[PDB]
Amino acid sequence: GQLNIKKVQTALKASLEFNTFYAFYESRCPKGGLHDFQDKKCVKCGLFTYIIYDHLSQPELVHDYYNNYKDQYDKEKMS
């Protein structure tokens, strides 16, 4: 109970958004065409930032880079 719910919820909403983003882009690339080795920003900006989620501020930038892509694909799927 000591844990703050409003902090838990806002962390989960970012955790859910980032997990769903990377789950959707498990093979897909935000710029399209797999290429999850190094190309563009499909996989990493160095290190293990794409799954480890605790290196911080790499997911905060990359997910914000392609937030529009995430919004447009979710509604296309939900149709």
- Shortest separation between residue 3's beta carbon and another protein, angstroms: 27
* Measured CA distances, 1 to 6, 11, 15, 51 (Å): 12, 16, 20, 29
Helices (H), ranges, 25-66: 49-52, 59-65
Q: Which is nearer to another protein, 1 or 37 (CB)?
A: 37
- Shortest separation between residue 23's beta carbon and another protein, angstroms: 13
Residues that bind another protein (CB under 8 A): 26-29, 32-37, 43, 73, 76-79
- Shortest separation between residue 54's beta carbon and another protein, angstroms: 18
